[PDB]
Design a protein around this ligand. Structure first.
Ligand SMILES: Nc1ncnc2c1ncn2[C@@H]1O[C@H](COP(=O)(O)OP(=O)(O)NP(=O)(O)O)[C@@H](O)[C@H]1O
Ligand SMILES: Nc1ncnc2c1ncn2[C@@H]1O[C@H](COP(=O)(O)OP(=O)(O)NP(=O)(O)O)[C@@H](O)[C@H]1O
Ligand code: NA
Ligand code: NA
Ligand code: NA
Ligand code: NA
Ligand code: NA
Ligand code: NA
Ligand code: NA
Ligand code: NA
Ligand code: NA
Ligand code: NA
Ligand code: NA
Ligand code: NA
Ligand code: NA
Ligand code: NA
Lengths: 327, 395
């Protein structure tokens, strides 16, 4: 009836009146590898901390948070689990096979909790089974990812081996020509970590704009005439548009596009730039609705629903300790 | 009727074609290979005959000399004056060259300046231009750049989301390659269709050992899959294409790969060869798969998905699609790959005609389809000769 959501130099918490969702136990785990295709009742501790081998600075913090927290069932909820329905063609990188079979390098995806939440939130609003829709959902925040949901399963998503890749984000470059990296090492003697910092901490909106990691900040610099900030927002939109384009291709069409996250739920600019000239899909926004961020913002003529859904990952975590620990 | 020669000088290669212009008739073609190395071979073919001689070819200066004396000694040319212009393929023109250039003194220094970015090719490409200008002083020469075609891309398409300094100080951006090929089949499509290219939204798929896809809208490249170097974009023969950049620091921090080994992992050990473990030739991977090799079959399916994904990006960029072009050794011949690539595109009115695709006909789309799907043999030497005759013989 009353469950709590833990997210471990930090310890976010939130207790909810379940199942009404009323309100600042289940445990957010950053990487479940391939072992956890779903949220797991908690031995589970020891294969959580083992996969720390691929989520070093997040996995053991979360699994020690599970230990600190008796007689209360705990469910571990893995940001990666939603994406374990991807086929090999979606998660195998064209590297030498041994890099996957002996080192576990493959696309994994993250934000799986939020994508799962908002996609079925969307289905409930339309009154149809999620499996009846072809959905692209964009979680757009400090981190950003796109996700393609078809027949109720995630079939692709933009973050790869680590949460650094995919679309452009606040400080993460997203995907870039990989051959840039051996060039940077041989021209600026960048160490493995400096490269890693370059990609994770000074790229994206921050590196392009020179102003800020924050969309709202960059958007003010660009309206006051800053050219690098204006370009930044443009490239931001384009990265996400190209990714959406891949996923529509993969699914053979599109029934609904979902925006969420700090930018997705609030930025009328981001959403209008991202949806520009898509009449060939039957997608168009309505200015008035887009502007007040109504739940559905598509034009009445439009064939593709466009939804602005606020993601609530603690409430989604709640609904899983209720399902696997007190059924 | 002019006699134009197209030249492509590799690090140890010297490919060449002699064309009768402006018809396009091929008089002779050939390759000098293993230059400097032992095993140096010279092959020369015309319509009728073929000549091949293993013999010591020291430097490129000696490859060019055997080429010129063979043209007269095989009765191909009556004299070397008969040659009206030489066009040279050049790997990387950076931002300086938006088009093919008549070879100046300035053109050649500007080309060696860009060696910074195409180190294994640009220096030797310029070597070819110099040797020919010495050995054929009277003949005009034109540089044709693999990037030039993509110089019509906008910032939001060639800027990588790195710190600005990385572009404004080290020139790191998407350049794109295969310009000459995409240019050529773009424009061939518009001829064979009787429409002007300004009127079409085209996606062009050069699928060979290297593979790239290119979005042409209103007559211009507006995006292309290869970025900073020809390693990136879709999956290829032994090139990985685009992967997660964070894999690279991981592998350096974990396996200790130098900058050079990362380049070889990405360029020579990945792709079709990396995934199938079989080979880098699409045909040999395909034989392996139909024999039951699951990795080979996986490799052919990943290859198709990576190309579908890029097409998807560019179709969205242009607001639709009017024609899809398949070229290169795989695009031109593999009805299977074209089929796997075009499946379930009813959302764009795109559908293939099986009988036409099996024959590799010129248009393979289905009868009720809204999108034209063309199978066009790329012909970069022809594209080069046309640029030589545009800029070196304006009459
Ligand atoms: N009203 C707004 N208008 C525009 N952008 C906004 C607005 N509010 C927040 N943002 C942006 O969205 C970000 C907040 O995203 P948020 O979803 O809270 O991130 P997060 O979930 O805490 N971290 P992550 O899970 O990695 O995305 C801010 O840093 C701003 O860039
Ligand atoms: N009949 C065929 N069916 C399928 N694949 C084929 C066929 N013939 C050739 N290929 C493939 O075509 C590939 C390369 O063709 P080609 O385009 O000539 O290479 P290339 O021009 O030397 N390098 P590049 O132009 O950069 O792609 C080979 O690696 C084969 O896998
Ligand atoms: Na679905
Ligand atoms: Na992403
Ligand atoms: Na990106
Ligand atoms: Na499809
Ligand atoms: Na050359
Ligand atoms: Na450009
Ligand atoms: Na270019
Ligand atoms: Na390219
Ligand atoms: Na070009
Ligand atoms: Na162009
Ligand atoms: Na490519
Ligand atoms: Na790739
Ligand atoms: Na568009
Ligand atoms: Na379809």
């Amino acid at each position: 009836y009353k469950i709590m959501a833990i997210n471990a130099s930090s310890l976010k918490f939130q207790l909810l009146n379940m199942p009404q969702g009323a309100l600042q136990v289940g445990h957010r785990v950053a990487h479940g590898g391939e072992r956890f295709k779903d949220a797991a009742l908690v031995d589970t501790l020891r294969e959580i901390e083992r996969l720390a081998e691929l989520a070093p600075l997040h996995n053991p913090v979360n699994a020690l948070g599970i230990r600190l927290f008796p007689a209360v069932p705990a469910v571990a909820v893995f940001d990666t689990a939603f994406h374990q329905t991807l086929a090999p063609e979606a998660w195998l990188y064209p590297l030498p096979w041994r890099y996957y079979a002996e080192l576990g390098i493959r696309r994994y995806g993250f934000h799986g909790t939020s994508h799962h939440y908002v996609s079925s939130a969307l289905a409930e609003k339309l009154g149809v089974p999620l499996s009846a829709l072809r959905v692209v959902s964009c979680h757009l925040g400090n981190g950003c990812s796109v996700c393609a949901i078809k027949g109720g399963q995630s079939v692709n998503t933009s973050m790869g081996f680590t949460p650094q890749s995919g679309v452009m984000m606040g400080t993460r470059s997203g995907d870039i020509d990989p051959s840039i990296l051996p060039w940077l090492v041989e021209k600026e003697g960048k160490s493995a970590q400096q490269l890693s910092q370059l990609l994770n901490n000074e790229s994206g909106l921050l590196g392009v704009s020179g102003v800020s990691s924050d969309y709202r900040d960059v958007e003010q610099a660009a309206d006051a005439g800053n050219e690098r900030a204006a370009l930044a927002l443009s490239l931001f939109a384009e990265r996400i548009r190209a990714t959406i384009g891949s996923y529509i291709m993969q699914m053979g069409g599109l029934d609904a596009l979902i925006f969420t996250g700090g930018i997705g739920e609030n930025s009328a600019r981001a959403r209008a730039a991202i949806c520009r000239n898509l009449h060939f899909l039957g997608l168009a926004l309505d200015d008035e609705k887009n502007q007040r961020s109504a739940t559905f913002i598509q034009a009445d003529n439009a064939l593709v629903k466009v939804a602005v859904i606020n993601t609530n990952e603690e409430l989604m975590i709640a609904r899983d300790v209720m399902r696997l620990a007190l059924p």
